Amino acid sequence: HWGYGKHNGPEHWHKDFPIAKGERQSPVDIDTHTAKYDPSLKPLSVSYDQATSLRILNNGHAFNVEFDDSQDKAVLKGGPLDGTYRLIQFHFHWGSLDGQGSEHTVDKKKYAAELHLVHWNTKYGDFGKAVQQPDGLAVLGIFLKVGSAKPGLQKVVDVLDSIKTKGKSADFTNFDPRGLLPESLDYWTYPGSLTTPPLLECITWIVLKEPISVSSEQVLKFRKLNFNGEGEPEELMVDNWRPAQPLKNRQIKASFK
C-alpha cells in the first residue's frame, strides 16, 4: 500500500490514485513575488476557545490529534472561505533532518516540518461527504523551523512515546491548539488537494506566512515515531511529506501587502 518509501512513495501514488496528476494537486511551491495581494479577502477567523481534543492516534503515516467535531466548537471562517469549517484533527509532516520536512515550500525553501489543522465545511454534514466537494475542506498550514522551543507543543511531544507504532492511540483531552499558532495570521491561499491518498481535490489551502519555532529536542521526538506496527522491523517515521506539485492553472493569493 502507499507510503513514503522508495517503492511506495509519492512518485508511485498515481497508479492507485490517478488524480495524483490532476489539475489542483497539493502541495505547491509558493513563489512570494508572484503571489498577488487580494484586497477582497475578508479577515481570517480562527475560533478555537471551545475546542475539545479527544485522542491522539499513530495511523502509520503521521499522528493525528483528534477533536470532537459533532458540534461547532472549534471553527475556521473568513479569509477566502464561505461558511463554517469544523476542526476535525491536526497532524504534522516532517523530515529526517531540519533542512526538509514541509510539504509547501516558499521560494523553494523547505521548512523542518509543517502543521495541518484540518477542517470540514459544515454545509456538507459530515467529513466523508465534504471530501467529495471542491470546497469541502479548509486546511490551515503552519511552517515549523528549528530554534526556540514551542511551549504549546510540549504536551504533544511528551505523549509520542505512548503511540510509537501504527494503530496505537492515547487519550489526549484538554489540549488547546491556540498554543500552536504564530503571532500573525497573514497567509497565502489557493485551491488544492489532500496531500495524502486519496489526494481528493477538495481543499482550500490557507498557509500562514509566519513559521512557529520548535526546538531540536521537540522535532527529534517526532523522528522517534515508527511507520510500522508493534513488533515489526523498525522504520522511523520521517520524511512523511509529499513534494511540491505543478501549479497549473492556479493563482496563489496573499492576504497581506
Smallest distance from Zn ion to CB 199, Å: 12
Taking the CA atoms of residue 126, residue 129, residue 133 and residue 138 in that order, the dihedral angle to the nearest 10 degrees is: 30
Say if residues 238 and 95 touch (Cβ distance below 8 Å): yes
Site for Zn ion, residues 80 to 99, rule: CB under 5 A: none
Say if residues 28 and 244 touch (Cβ distance below 8 Å): yes
**What is the grid cell recorded at 225?**
515515531
Count of residues that interact with Zn ion, criterion CB under 5 A:
1
Say if residues 236 and 94 touch (Cβ distance below 8 Å): no
Instruction: Compute the 3-state secondary structure of the chain and give helix, strand, coil in percent, each to the nearest 5.
Output: 15, 30, 55
Give the residue closest to Zn ion by C-beta.
116
| Options 51-59, 116-124, 153-161, 167-175: segment touching Zn ion (CB under 5 A) | 116-124
Q: How far is CA 102 from CA 105, 106, 244, in A?
A: 7, 10, 10
Was 196 annotated as part of a binding site?
yes
| Options 27-35, 63-71, 110-118, 231-239: segment touching Zn ion (CB under 5 A) | 110-118
| Options 30-38, 113-121, 148-156, 232-240: segment touching Zn ion (CB under 5 A) | 113-121
Cβ proximity to Zn ion, 3 vs 38, nearer residue:
3
Binding string, 130-149, against Zn ion, x = CB under 5 A? --------------------
Report if residue 119 touches Zn ion, rule: CB under 5 A: no
Report if residue 209 touches Zn ion, rule: CB under 5 A: no
Residue appearing with cell numbers 522517534: 224
Site for Zn ion, residues 6 to 25, rule: CB under 5 A: none
Clarify whether 104 is annotated catalytic: no
Helices (H), the chain: 127-130, 154-159, 216-222
Peptide bond into 43 cis (omega under 30): no
| Catalytic member of 1, 7, 14, 61 | 61
| Sign of the torsion angle spanned by Cα atoms 236, 169, 87, 175 | negative
Report if residue 116 touches Zn ion, rule: CB under 5 A: yes
Was 116 annotated as part of a binding site?
yes
List binding-site positions for Zn(2+): 91, 93, 116
Please give the positions annotated as active site: 61
Binding site residues, Zn ion, CB under 5 A: 116
Binding site residues, as ranges? 91, 93, 116, 195-196
